Swiss-Prot record, chains A, B:
Entry EC number(s): 1.14.99.1
Domain EGF-like: 1-38
Record keywords: Acetylation, Dioxygenase, Disulfide bond, Endoplasmic reticulum, Fatty acid biosynthesis, Fatty acid metabolism, Glycoprotein, Heme, Iron, Lipid biosynthesis, Lipid metabolism, Membrane, Metal-binding, Microsome, Nucleus, Oxidoreductase, Peroxidase, Prostaglandin biosynthesis, Prostaglandin metabolism, S-nitrosylation, Signal
Entry-listed glycosylation sites: 36, 113, 379
Residue positions of the active site: 176 (proton acceptor), 354 (for cyclooxygenase activity)
Description of post-translational modifications: S-nitrosylation by NOS2 (iNOS) activates enzyme activity. S-nitrosylation may take place on different Cys residues in addition to Cys-509. Acetylated at Ser-548 by SPHK1. During neuroinflammation, acetylation by SPHK1 promotes neuronal secretion of specialized preresolving mediators (SPMs), especially 15-R-lipoxin A4, which results in an increase of phagocytic microglia.
Keyword Transferase: no
Pathway entry: Lipid metabolism; prostaglandin biosynthesis
More details: The conversion of arachidonate to prostaglandin H2 is a 2 step reaction: a cyclooxygenase (COX) reaction which converts arachidonate to prostaglandin G2 (PGG2) and a peroxidase reaction in which PGG2 is reduced to prostaglandin H2 (PGH2). The cyclooxygenase reaction occurs in a hydrophobic channel in the core of the enzyme. The peroxidase reaction occurs at a heme-containing active site located near the protein surface. The nonsteroidal anti-inflammatory drugs (NSAIDs) binding site corresponds to the cyclooxygenase active site.
Residue numbers bearing the O-acetylserine modification: 548
Gene from which the chain derives: Ptgs2
Record family assignment: Belongs to the prostaglandin G/H synthase family.
Domain of life: Eukaryota
Organism expressing this protein natively: Mus musculus
Name assigned to this protein: Prostaglandin G/H synthase 2
Length: 552, 552
């Protein structure tokens, strides 16, 4: 078998075979040399001594709030820190991208083919003795066993950071513009050829789909009026394809950019909000540009809403789950004097640690009503019944589950959680420890250290036997939560590089785009730089209800 | 009507309408302020004073050969200048790309849609009074008039720099991997979705086409043996589509990556050479990696040949036409400490100024034979007759015409030259002077200054009346050539940024790719770093005839 199967190369060295039973490690620019790139250079020895731990950084950013209250009001220093936050995370990601599910080596097929999710780590070779190379048994433990024992939800474990359902459905709505798996090809394939925040979940993946959804007047998208409230148009009125149970009434078959956003009314809520936001920016742009035609009013409104998205995600969405007292900042001009690639390819592993199944409640509580999963699914009549106002007010109050910590996956979606385990195996994922070393983390030495707890850790040791054979996805949902937080170390340290790269690696953040003229002047430019989840609801949702990603 | 038709904004400022008859210029990071971005900042005033002219740079690099002979042997200094050569040219190009033929403003359609050629300058609005904006008459002069008078070839004007037919057909073969116009859509559209050097003109634009051309054993491409000589396979044996006169025998219908390379036997020569080179590198990679399968031997051989191409282009191809005594250097490690986007998008204007029609001779001289255009076109039996050896030996001897200077377009291809004039008009190109200011050149003040001569300059003034209405493409072929050179100032200053960006903006030049493991070891890695047009022929062409881009 592959002499590279054992995963010998350390510190991001690359293993190439030099015979049937021989390998060589390429230690090019890894700060290490030696057979498996383990002998550190003198400057590397220094850096290794001087960088503190992720757990060290998290403590500082989650404490000393009073001194952060000072830092948050010193522009240069605030800009200085955010500059290091952006830069230091963005060396973890290969750009241009390297591997995918079919190529454990760099190739033009891997690079050029955009139908692929890329890969932070190359897939385990198909001729390897074990599913993880050389370690463990011939076959990995039963997914159903792992699922039931340490993953499935017994009693509801609420998020200590106080995440609500506004946060839950945002994450679902937001990330599904680039998490569009091509099931007809496999789990390692995406239909999101934009590979980032293009808002195709609002406008459409293709130009053909977009023109069906557009009104072709004043740059607006088509809509319908029900009960005096603005909602998306219908599938019959537009003939864009949507995924629905064939028993759904025609007037309830809404048509939006993403074809699956009819799944849950939570997605259709944001889909309605973000649609209203488009036709609001259009009105503002026509207010300043009466000379503009429909085509330019649309394209400009799109770029603005893209910036609005990134703005909200950083200073509202990421701000919340980080639990940082340091107040984040969406500002592309911090990267202009830095080496940064304005491009991004979505990774399979980033879609993997995004399966925040524990974030889903047991019932969906709206106004004075508790809906089961069976009642909520594909039921937009719920949305028409309460309206967006009562929807936001309710979802801002209902709390979401804890992702990390173990045993919090709602049993309604058990099959989906078991699929995440199965698909990651099918895509020949490397072990948890290999992904930790990949992101400069220290390999867990025991299952107990992973959980900071004895019960589940004993369950896991009976299943996997060896800590170096533990799988990535189940480890995330059981990892010892950070203190009073929603995630563990591995979730944040792996997901943060993937996230800030897809956001800042957007063409509108590049110096040639990041300028008032691109967005229709200072008026349109302001819309982006002052964007927030509160004003997004205040502007589009009737009555302007208070909203947040946190419960009061 | 559009207030920005007059092209008011200077120094790369962007024009935006602020009313039906009102405009605003965005002077963001242009080094200028004021109404049309013309008031220079103090540091800009300094740089403007200290920045030498392009003609100043050209004289230095084309003189002091003895002192350059010293510079060429001092690695650091040699690395130092090339670093400035790469960097200083690569700020002229927008990256990520901005405009295309349909969008004179930044938009997501312009950025995401890869079917478009991008645009250095946005197209003139469709509602502008004149085809150039506001200057000139209602209609531009007759293309046939311009063509016949100053463009068409009277007596053959040989290239002073001594370009041969090896250089002419290389340029045609090389640049046609990203110059694949989608005529079904229009001149502003490309079928080259790779938008760079992907060698799809050898392997294929699509994965489907590639698999038809591969042998699927040892990573090699399919071929046939005629007269003991290796040639491309046939259309019947592979069923890849090729463009042929349906009167062509079946054994003469060769199948290569690019579907039009059956046009002239000069293209079919390199297509045969570059095919032989593939199955030569495969044998070497199998020599080092007997454990490798067909798929990896192919993908690795492609990446190497990609590097081989870039290597040859810089240090042989660009080296020649530059006429520099300074010896160029293909070395990606010069950009690692520099801000550089490893991405590229092809521009309509770059395809325009690469219509080197004057480079084409009156007859095609092989061995002791002189072929007309009518005899050469679609006649591969010429290639079988003389073989590659006699093909290279002859083409290295035959000289090519002078591009700039005026009146050197062979009349046999006059319609192609008239198409270049027409297409540029159809694509709403801005004037010559607007493209010069765009690339920091000084606007020509008279037609004579442009020609450095009186007669063509008068014929041109009778046609266009005003120098600010002169078109880009005809200006290139009549421009006052540099001292005993093939081009004028505008050709080099516009084309050099476009070229070095598409070359270095290749993923294999990125730090994560540029390492021995990517190319199968140090044996494969050296193949790239030692690549040259001489060894490319020596290795693949029988007898190893001396070859160059210059006549002896
Ligand atoms: C990207 O890769 C996928 C998978 O290798 C390609 O999809 C295959 O395309 C061939 C071409 O005809 C088909 O025969 C296969 O059935 C396809 N397989 C799957 C799983 O889709 C895809 O064509 C590639 N994309 C590009 C642009 O080359
Ligand atoms: C890129 O833009 C071109 C031109 O706008 C698109 O081509 C058009 O596509 C629509 C979609 O159905 C067709 O109805 C038109 O006939 C096409 N016109 C031309 C001239 O080709 C193309 O689809 C766009 N590409 C992408 C990926 O969106
Ligand atoms: C300037 C103040 C520096 C304090 C740094 C905090 C160091 C303690 O940080 C600790 O790191 C541990 C490592 O696993 C974690 O388990 C703990 O949760 C965390 O408190
Ligand atoms: C060592 C410094 C020598 C200065 C070299 C530049 C001066 C001569 O350069 C001249 O510049 C003109 C445009 O600028 C061109 O028309 C001439 O052909 C070119 O020779
Ligand atoms: C899987 C994951 C991991 C981390 C984050 N956000 C985040 C974080 F939680 C801490 C520090 C930085 C960032 Cl960008 C996020 C949020 C997101 O970018 O969608 C997801
Ligand atoms: C239209 C054009 C302009 C310039 C060049 N090469 C070139 C040159 F001619 C002088 C200095 C640098 C470079 Cl990269 C070339 C040759 C090429 O890179 O294909 C074409
Ligand atoms: C790592 O290097 C050591 C010696 O430095 C060698 O014995 C070993 O085989 C290498 N690989 C692994 C996976 O340990
Ligand atoms: C949809 O929601 C409504 C409440 O508005 C509920 O009465 C109905 O039963 C739901 N549909 C299904 C199929 O459960
Ligand atoms: C440039 O600015 C001047 C004043 O600074 C103004 O009169 C003129 O209209 C502007 N545009 C052009 C094309 O000159
Ligand atoms: C093709 O070239 C051959 C010379 O090898 C010549 O005899 C023949 O006439 C040419 N074909 C045509 C159609 O002119």
């Amino acid at each position: 078998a592959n002499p590279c199967c054992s995963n010998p190369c350390q510190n991001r060295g690359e293993c190439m075979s030099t015979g049937f039973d021989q390998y060589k490690c390429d230690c090019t620019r890894t700060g290490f040399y030696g057979e498996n790139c383990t002998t550190p250079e003198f400057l590397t020895r220094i850096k290794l001594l001087l960088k503190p731990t992720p757990n060290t950084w998290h403590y500082i950013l989650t404490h000393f709030k009073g001194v952060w209250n000072i830092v948050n009001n010193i522009p240069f220093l605030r800009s200085l820190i955010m500059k290091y936050v952006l830069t230091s995370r963005s060396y973890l990601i290969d750009s241009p991208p390297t591997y995918n599910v079919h190529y454990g080596y760099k190739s033009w097929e891997a690079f050029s083919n955009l139908s692929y999710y890329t890969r932070a780590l190359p897939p385990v070779a198909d001729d390897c003795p074990t599913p993880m190379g050389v370690k463990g048994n011939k076959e990995l433990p039963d997914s159903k066993e792992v699922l039931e024992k340490v993953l499935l939800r017994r009693e509801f474990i609420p998020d200590p950071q106080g995440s609500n359902m506004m946060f839950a459905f945002f994450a679902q709505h937001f990330t599904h513009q680039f998490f569009k798996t091509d099931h007809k090809r496999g789990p390692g394939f995406t239909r999101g050829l934009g590979h980032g925040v293009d808002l195709n979940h609002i406008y459409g993946e293709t130009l053909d789909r977009q023109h069906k959804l557009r009104l072709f007047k004043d740059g607006k998208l088509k809509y319908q009026v029900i009960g005096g409230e603005v909602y998306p148009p219908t599938v019959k009125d537009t003939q864009v394809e949507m995924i629905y149970p064939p028993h759904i009434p025609e007037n309830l078959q809404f048509a939006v950019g993403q074809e699956v956003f009819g799944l849950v009314p939570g997605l259709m809520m944001y889909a309605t909000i973000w649609l209203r936001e488009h036709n609001r920016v259009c009105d503002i742009l026509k207010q300043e540009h009466p000379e503009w035609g429909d085509e330019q009013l649309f394209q400009t409104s799109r770029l603005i809403l893209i910036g609005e998205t990134i703005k909200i995600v950083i200073e509202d969405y990421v701000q919340h789950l980080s639990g940082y007292h340091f107040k984040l900042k969406f500002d592309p001009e911090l990267l202009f004097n830095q080496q940064f690639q304005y491009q991004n390819r979505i990774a399979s592993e980033f879609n993997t640690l995004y399966h925040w199944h524990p974030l889903l409640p047991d019932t969906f509580n709206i106004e004075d009503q508790e809906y089961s999963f069976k009642q909520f699914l594909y039921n937009n009549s719920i949305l028409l019944e309460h309206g967006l106002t009562q929807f936001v007010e309710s979802f801002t109050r209902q709390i979401a589950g804890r992702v990390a910590g173990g045993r919090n996956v709602p049993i309604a979606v058990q099959a989906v959680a078991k699929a995440s385990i199965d698909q990651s195996r099918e895509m020949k994922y490397q072990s948890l420890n290999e992904y930790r070393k990949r992101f400069s983390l220290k390999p867990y030495t025991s299952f107990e250290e992973l959980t900071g707890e004895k019960e589940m850790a004993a369950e896991l040791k009976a299943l996997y036997s060896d800590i170096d054979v533990m799988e990535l996805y189940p480890a995330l949902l059981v990892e010892k939560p950070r203190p009073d937080a929603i995630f563990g170390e591995t979730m944040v340290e792996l997901g943060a590089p993937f996230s800030l790269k897809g956001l800042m690696g957007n063409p509108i953040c590049s110096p040639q785009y990041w300028k008032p003229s691109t967005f229709g002047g200072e008026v349109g430019f302001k819309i982006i730089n002052t964007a927030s989840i509160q004003s997004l609801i205040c502007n589009n949702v009737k009555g302007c209800p208070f909203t947040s990603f946190n419960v009061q």
